[PDB]
A paper describes a structure:
[name] ([name], EC 4.1.1.25) is classified into Group II and shares high identity with L-3,4-dihydroxy-L-phenylalanine (DOPA) decarboxylase (DDC), glutamic acid decarboxylase (GAD), and histidine decarboxylase (HDC). [name] could catalyze the decarboxylation of L-tyrosine and L-DOPA to tyramine and dopamine. LbTDC is a homodimer, and the two subunits exist in an asymmetric form. Similar to the structures of other Group II decarboxylases, each LbTDC monomer is composed of three distinct domains: the N-terminal (residues 7–105) domain, the PLP-binding (residues 106–462) domain, and the small (residues 463–618) domain.
After optimization of the crystallization conditions, the crystals of LbTDC alone and in complex with PLP (apo-LbTDC and holo-LbTDC, respectively) were obtained and the corresponding three-dimensional structures were resolved. Compared with the open conformation of the apo form of the human DDC structure, the structure of apo-LbTDC is in a closed conformation. A comparison of the structure of apo-LbTDC with the structure of holo-LbTDC revealed that there are two opposite conformations of K240 and H241. In the apo-LbTDC structure, the imidazole ring of H241 is anchored by two water molecules and is distant from the PLP binding pocket, and the side chain of K240 is placed in a position near the PLP binding pocket. Residues K240 and H241 form a short flexible loop. Additionally, through a structural alignment with drDDC and pig DDC, a conserved histidine (H192) was also identified, which has been reported to interact with the pyridine ring of PLP. This interesting dynamic change in conformation suggests that K240 and H241 play important roles in establishing the conformation required for the binding and stabilization of cofactor and substrate.
Numbering used by the authors:
A (entry chain A): 7 to 418, 431 to 620
B (entry chain B): 6 to 45, 49 to 417, 431 to 618
């Protein structure tokens, strides 16, 4: 059952180890396409002949095209920022995509079908429908749907469009046919569960188009529809979506995050109750699976339980899960029949399917619990071009109930149901090929997501007790938290130095040493990324951490931030002990050397 | 240097993959260059012992099985490839070879153009593409970028208009002296340039001003009506829905018998709203309409705006040139300067844009394109008439300062979408650098398309058929503004419009493929209905000219139209078209015989 699937065979390789394989398969596919143009329908005629191809103007034009491509080729290689290789690159980026996804794009692009125009793309249109079904099955939706989006931010925007329109439907039904919602107060109309709204819409029958005309689509009083509650670290990104969708940026309300950088569910409830008390509705809540700088996974199960509790008090909220980064990781929890694996059996199933090379606990109970609850969310974002290992650009959205698409649809198949317009069939081919090489369960993506998580854990373990002596100073590595997923963060700190401004200065100077300045010829032996956790975006979420290092709350406010060394361990190659242990002493040496340069330059 | 003998035949794989080996040779060179770049003392994580292990070989075989399934679907669940001379429908899938090759190569890096660090070369390429767009459109101080598609480019244009309309009031809220003495009506009719100048004068206050703009969600419907040609009414309802003004704020403007926006109607509509003190959020003019290839009189709209400004009325102008945008290259000389009308045929002959020295471009089309530089924003799609592979749309803005009105905190800060592939920028860049956006490059390609359309149009206006005792005529719709050509077949003297609609639908079914078709057809067409809700009475003059009554028009509610968008480059040559002409005629005869059988 794909038991001994070997991930090394599914990538070009950091050193182009499988380059010839890629080239061979690429040429086979291109040959298939060229043969199809030539022979699929004999006649023709050929519009271009040898007499044309051997003319001087033709040959000149080929030379001109070569000059353009050679220029393009040179610019990309000259400006490029040396290829990241496993063991040396421990930063936030990844440029290693699945070979079948690459090949499928290359091949399908030759037909250049547009997936909104079926006639140009019958094959890739069907592939995108299957991808939608595969997303729905991955998320445990029994009657859901999904599609590929131009990118992940547009997928989130589409989720908000869904929430906005759905929230407005009971009022739209009241205006078109009061009998549909007779005996319900306006507050009750604004707190109707989504499935009930959808049932009512379907029940409007002949009147559905008229109801849609009176919904948020009409633009009437969008701020009546309530507040959009998001983790504080996502507040800025959601302001843009709220701005675009017309509810306005003040309708986005930040919810504090905790010391795990997950949404604080006690705070979530307090905020909801505050608005409910003044009869301000909640348009929706966003839970994050795989935060941008910490890989944190919000307690989706706790949010769902909270909603169930509040419904007894007449409060409902739409739930959107942003699993842009963490979506494919749900494949860890589905067996070969796509059934959700009970927690007590997870390590057993993972060993049987060689998901992890060592039998240990990698997935936290609270992470498992969050993933289990995804099937309760109205919508979920999941991006193939993040942890799906599909080339940019490919985002994704999944909806709980296929009927939801009727709330945003425009008529006169696929094009009627989406926010965007024209879209490449090649993208659908690319995602489809990835999904069919690696099924969305433990037999396929479970292994790939597993390899990444295992690499993260090895790196975390390596950092945990790391100590250095530089110019007579003891310097310690302090990992931020044990990873919920595959992102690992840490700070370097001079022992006994309790000046937080100085620690930030250290980690900033360290990052600059362990990174490239453009025009860089030499590849380094250790590259990292970085970010700041600043009060305006993080609140006091990092306070317990900085206090654990010996800093005071007074010190925390004086600095107003903490600088963090960042890794997103997306490479699949660091799961093997042999592979990581080879690099461990070399990383240690690189860090020692970088720290020396830092201290030397003062 | 001037690319005088640039040969379009060398720039495509070809309908029969005539240039297939060239594509492969160039592709392999590029792939080799990337692979060698990755290879530039560490051990390899994928060793030779790994690659020769049984599990590795088994996995490779698994991958090959998947790609074989992919291949079967795409090859066999397909509509046959378009064959020039036989295919006269509304679509095109052929792409410029350098655009394909550039994408193939760049995507190997998997750069993301919102993260410059991830993609410095392709980020520069997208900036250059934006500048190239601005130059094509005559915008001395403008900018642009690639968008996922044209519908999103239109949405972004509306986002701009919406935010910009709201800025005068926003400025009043933050600093009344910026707009002292200005009534609310004056605030709602400030020309965009004045708004941008004031916003620049606001200096560091810009961020607080933006908080009080339409970004706040407040007073969206106060911003006024969005006026679009009737044939775009439905598509703009979706954009207005998304952006929060609401579909109720979209107002259809009647189109004329040339399927161009009626500018007298536009003026009547604007004056009526302005007399009520309802502002106009904006007007959309279309260059290259969806089913007729019509070009609105952008120049007439610009002149109307100037007239109305004297009376305290302003409107934002967005030009939707998704289809017709690259055709502006017909009007730019080798130094990208607009060609005087009297010199157009001379310059076109000097540069082999057209195969004959005669008139091809209507004066009113020339005039419309010349006025583009007065529009606040313009949509243009590389994946339509730029021959770049999907997905690649585009937007151009008149004044770079406009991007400050929609920005969030380079490139990612200034756009509606998020992540965008560096490969997409490479693909557009390679097309633009192979074919400059003037008569030396795209002029030739857009010209070849227009000329094919003209030959087809001339051929259609002399066609009669004797079939099953009946006499059938072809009636072309209108002379093309661009490269779209439409017609109807009709039984002579038959005044039943429902019957004519029946005939044209049945003809289309004979002259089209289905998924899985294998028998080659000598003639393929597309079709659409011009129905009253989208067209109003614009086709009434046409149907009356054929003998149908106005009563008959209302009875049927629509007219069925046989559709062609001549995007092939090969029908510009007389020798080529004249070969297929007798064949098309015989195919129409045969298809009609089947219809009437
Ligand atoms: Mg000028």
């Amino acid at each position: 059952s794909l038991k001994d699937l070997d991930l090394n065979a599914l990538f070009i390789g950091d050193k182009a180890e499988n380059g010839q394989l890629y080239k061979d398969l690429l040429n086979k596919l291109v040959d298939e396409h060229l043969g199809w143009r030539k022979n699929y329908i004999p006649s023709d005629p050929n519009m271009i002949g040898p007499e044309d191809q051997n003319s001087p103007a033709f040959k000149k034009t080929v030379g001109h095209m070569k000059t353009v491509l050679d220029q393009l080729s040179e610019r990309i290689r000259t400006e490029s920022v040396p290829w990241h290789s496993a063991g040396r690159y421990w930063g936030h980026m990844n440029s290693e995509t699945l070979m079948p996804a690459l090949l499928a794009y290359n091949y399908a692009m030759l037909w250049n079908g547009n997936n909104v125009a079926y006639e140009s793309s019958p094959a890739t249109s069907q592939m995108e429908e299957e991808v939608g079904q595969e997303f729905a099955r991955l998320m445990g939706y029994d009657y859901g749907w999904g599609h590929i989006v131009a990118d992940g931010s547009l997928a989130n925007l589409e989720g908000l469009w869904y929430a906005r329109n759905i929230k407005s439907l009971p009022f739209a039904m009241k205006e078109v046919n009061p009998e549909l919602v007779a005996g319900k107060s306006d507050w009750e109309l604004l707190n109707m569960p989504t499935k009930e709204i959808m049932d009512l819409l379907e029940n409007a029958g002949s009147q559905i188009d008229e109801v849609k005309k009176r919904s948020a689509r009409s633009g009437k009083n969008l701020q009546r529809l309530g507040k959009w509650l998001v983790p504080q670290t996502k507040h800025y990104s959601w302001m843009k979506a709220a701005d675009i969708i017309g509810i306005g940026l003040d309708q986005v309300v930040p919810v504090p995050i905790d010391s795990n950088y997950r949404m604080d569910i006690q705070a979530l409830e307090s905020i909801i109750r505050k608005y409910a008390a003044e009869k301000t509705p909640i348009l929706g809540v966003v839970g994050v699976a795989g935060s941008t700088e910490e890989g944190a996974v919000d307690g989706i199960d706790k949010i769902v339980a909270l909603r169930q509790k509040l419904q007894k008090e007449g409060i409902y909220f739409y739930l959107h899960v942003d699993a842009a980064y963490g979506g494919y990781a749900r494949a860890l929890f589905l067996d070969e029949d796509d059934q959700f694996i009970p927690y007590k059996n997870l390590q057993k199933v993972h060993a049987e399917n060689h998901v992890f090379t060592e039998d240990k606990e990698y997935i936290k109970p609270e992470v498992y619990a969050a993933y289990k609850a995804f099937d309760q969310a109205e919508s979920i974002t999941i991006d193939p071009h993040k942890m799906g290992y599909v080339p940019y650009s490919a985002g994704g959205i999944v909806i709980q109930d296929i009927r939801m698409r009727d709330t945003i649809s425009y008529f006169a198949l696929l094009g009627a149901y989406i926010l965007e317009g024209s879209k490449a069939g090649a993208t659908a081919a690319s995602v489809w090929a990835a999904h069919h090489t690696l099924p969305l369960n433990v037999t396929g993506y479970g292994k790939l997501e597993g390899a990444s998580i295992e690499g993260a854990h090895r790196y975390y373990d390596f950092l945990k007790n790391l100590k250095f002596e530089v110019a007579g100073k003891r310097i310690s590595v302090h990992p931020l938290i044990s990873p919920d997923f595959n992102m690992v963060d840490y700070v370097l700190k001079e022992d006994g130095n309790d000046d937080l401004i100085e620690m930030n200065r250290l980690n900033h100077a360290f990052y600059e040493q362990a990174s490239y300045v453009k025009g860089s010829l030499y590849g380094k032996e250790y590259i990292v990324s970085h970010t700041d956790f600043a009060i305006p975006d993080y609140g006091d979420s990092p306070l317990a951490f900085v206090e654990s290092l010996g800093f005071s709350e007074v010190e925390w406010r004086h600095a107003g931030k903490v600088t963090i060394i960042r890794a997103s361990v997306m490479t699949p190659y660091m799961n093997q002990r042999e592979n990581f242990d080879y690099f461990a002493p070399r990383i240690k040496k690189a860090i020692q050397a970088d720290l020396e340069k830092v201290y030397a330059s003062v």
